[PDB]
Design a protein around this ligand. Structure first.
Ligand SMILES: CO/N=C(\C(=O)N[C@@H]1C(=O)N2C(C(=O)O)=C(CSc3nc(=O)c(=O)[nH]n3C)CS[C@H]12)c1csc(N)n1
Ligand SMILES: CCCCCCCCCCCCCC(=O)O
Ligand SMILES: CCCCCCCCCCCCCC(=O)O
Ligand SMILES: CCCCCCCCCCCCCC(=O)O
Ligand SMILES: CCCCCCCCCCCCCC(=O)O
Ligand SMILES: CCCCCCCCCCCCCC(=O)O
Length: 571
């Protein structure tokens, strides 16, 4: 268009425009205070209004990158605060913005955000609602420079709904705190899923990402033909490649073009896209990315005809292996939306290995004739883990299930630090409470999403501080074999028990006033140290020690009765 900034202002609207501009500047100038960014937003917005009134006005014909880069280089504190980022200003726009992207700090050293009191938040939300929501956008954008800015607007509007409803209820804290914990966890999980998917795209290559996209899209859109799914996978791969690069402009236009195409070909893709495609342009791609699974045609034949019993299995495979394997993934994924994506990739890799061996053997047809039998043990393994863990979760509670996982994982790998074993087991316990409530149709896909972000953060700290050879051996393994190995870990019999420290098991009455979360973490910390001290302790012996601890904590609310509890448990 003649004035691109005017076109953006008319499409997004003034409110969304200012919010997106605040996020854009906060992701590049992460160290500048909130008041400086509010001034920059008002200046860009006032300039955009001159272009809407007259697209032929001065500088209105410049590109968004030029206008943004020129405005980024007008900051007086650019040389002193960001240093090498000021050297980017001596380059032309094609190289200047790339120089800006290279200086985005994915891990800035900013202090933790502290949740204010409920009465303070509600008062602040009432006094100045706009700056309240803008402060949220500023703090999260500067801490996550690659966070998709429209998705950040999606969270900000949910905070507005949370404070609007809860600050007028009879009990504000009971209403607001569960919603804030939900928005906090989903926000941290969103940025964590983006970082993992971007890092996996650079390491494992584009082929592995397309294989993942084929499986997930075929589950999402089972009524679509393979040519349609393959066209969506190509566009989706291009979208993620650029969104991972950091250029917000190219990322958003790609997602806009993809959502526009999907909404224009609903009859060839899915029937569940009626609601998402009626939403505004800013919310299309985000909505489609979380659309519900469509129903399968139900008239789908078996896969043995095209992939097992046909005489041209090796011929069609030799013509284009990834296309043939992609068609195998497409057909298997559209028929099993209850499987996890990594499970479908597990079956595709098995079918790929089989064809490589069989198509070169003497009798290929007889060789891969029983390939589907290899898929059954691979499918039963996660299914039996879901039933085994959800049944154990049903007998116990969330806290008791977390303590059950603590003893299991401490015996298997006691070399891991105690706060890590506690934090991981608590998160794995929340995975069980969230996914075991779903029916079996959504249990395995639910577990995959939450386990992928928990197993990665377990090794996000273990890669910086290695302490176990078995843990780091399977976080360097393939992505489809990461979870199966963690389930295949065994008890370390060659582990000498840790020395008994009296100060470790020593407890004081200060834990009786602490919150429930604090008393649990303190009790769960001592449970790991007990297993590290006596890994050969039976489940019956361990329960007797835990039952005496719950009774001693109730009676002591000191050190005299604690000495008898240590000596009795040490026998
Ligand atoms: C910007 O914050 N300032 C606020 C305010 O609104 N705080 C809210 C509160 O308690 N919040 C929560 C959360 O739920 O923890 C959070 C946590 S969400 C989050 N935190 C991270 O560190 C991160 O990396 N990613 N994500 C997604 C953010 S602000 C909001 C405020 C209100 S009155 C006042 N004086 N300050
Ligand atoms: C039409 C798009 C085809 C995309 C390529 C599909 C290749 C399937 C390979 C299956 C095994 C992959 C395992 C892995 O990459 O981790
Ligand atoms: C201001 C600069 C960023 C503007 C991005 C707006 C893109 C909105 C639609 C993209 C999408 O489908 O999510
Ligand atoms: C979320 C990044 C892509 C945004 C555009 C979405 C286009 C349709 C995606 C369909 C759902 C895919 C979800 C997934 O692959 O995990
Ligand atoms: C915790 C709730 C039970 C989870 C069992 C393991 C499920 C693994 C599914 C993903 C995969 O295929 O590896
Ligand atoms: C520390 C080790 C943590 C291992 C977590 C494995 C993920 C859950 C798999 C289910 C299971 O086998 O118990």
């Amino acid at each position: 268009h003649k004035s691109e900034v005017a076109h953006r202002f008319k499409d997004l609207g003034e409110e969304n425009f200012k919010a997106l501009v605040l996020i854009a500047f906060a992701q590049y100038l992460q160290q500048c205070p909130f008041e400086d960014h509010v001034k920059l937003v008002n200046e860009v917005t006032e300039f955009a209004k001159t272009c809407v009134a007259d697209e032929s006005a001065e500088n209105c014909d410049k590109s968004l990158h030029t206008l943004f880069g020129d405005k980024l280089c007008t900051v007086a504190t650019l040389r002193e605060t960001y240093g090498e980022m000021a050297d980017c200003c001596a380059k032309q726009e094609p190289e200047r913005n790339e120089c800006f992207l290279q200086h985005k700090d994915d891990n800035p050293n900013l202090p933790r955000l502290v949740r204010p009191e409920v009465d303070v938040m509600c008062t602040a939300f009432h006094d100045n609602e706009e700056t309240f929501l803008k402060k949220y956008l500023y703090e999260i954008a500067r801490r996550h420079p690659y966070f998709y800015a429209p998705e950040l607007l999606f969270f900000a509007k949910r905070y507005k709904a949370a404070f609007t409803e809860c600050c007028q209820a009879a009990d504000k804290a009971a209403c607001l705190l569960p919603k804030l914990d939900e928005l906090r966890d989903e926000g941290k999980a969103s940025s964590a899923k983006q970082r993992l998917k971007c890092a996996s795209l650079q390491k494992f290559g584009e082929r592995a990402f397309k294989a993942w996209a084929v499986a997930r899209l075929s589950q999402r859109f089972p009524k679509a033909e393979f040519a349609e799914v393959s066209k969506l996978v190509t566009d989706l791969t291009k979208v993620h490649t650029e969104c991972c690069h950091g250029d917000l402009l190219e990322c958003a236009d790609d997602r806009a073009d993809l959502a526009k195409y999907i909404c224009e070909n609903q009859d060839s893709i899915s029937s569940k896209l009626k609601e998402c495609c009626e939403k505004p342009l800013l919310e299309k791609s985000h909505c489609i990315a979380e659309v519900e699974n469509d129903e399968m045609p139900a008239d789908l034949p078996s896969l043995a005809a095209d992939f097992v019993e046909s005489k041209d299995v090796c011929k069609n495979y030799a013509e284009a292996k990834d296309v043939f394997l992609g068609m195998f993934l497409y057909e298997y994924a559209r028929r099993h939306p209850d499987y996890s994506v990594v499970l479908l990739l597990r079956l595709a890799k098995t079918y790929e290995t089989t064809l490589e061996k069989c198509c070169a053997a003497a009798d290929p047809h007889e060789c891969y004739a029983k390939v589907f039998d290899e898929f059954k043990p691979l499918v039963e393994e996660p299914q039996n883990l879901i039933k085994q863990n959800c049944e154990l979760f049903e007998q116990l509670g969330e806290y008791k299930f977390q303590n059950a996982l603590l003893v299991r994982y401490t015996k298997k790998v006691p070399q891991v630090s105690t706060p890590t074993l506690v934090e991981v087991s608590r998160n794995l316990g929340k995975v069980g409470s969230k996914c075991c409530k779903h029916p079996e149709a959504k249990r395995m896909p639910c577990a995959e999403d939450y386990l992928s972000v928990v197993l990665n953060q377990l090794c996000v700290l273990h890669e910086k501080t290695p302490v176990s050879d078995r843990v780091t051996k399977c976080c360097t393994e393939s992505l489809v074999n990461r979870r199966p190995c963690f389930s295949a870990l065994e008890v370390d019999e060659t582990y000498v028990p840790k020395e008994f420290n009296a100060e470790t098991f020593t407890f004081h009455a200060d834990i009786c006033t602490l919150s429930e979360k604090e008393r649990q973490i303190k009790k769960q910390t001592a449970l790991v140290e007990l297993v590290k001290h006596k890994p050969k302790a039976t489940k019956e012996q361990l329960k007797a020690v835990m039952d005496d601890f719950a009774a001693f904590v109730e009676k002591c609310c000191f050190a005299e009765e604690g000495k008898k509890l240590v000596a009795a448990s040490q026998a």
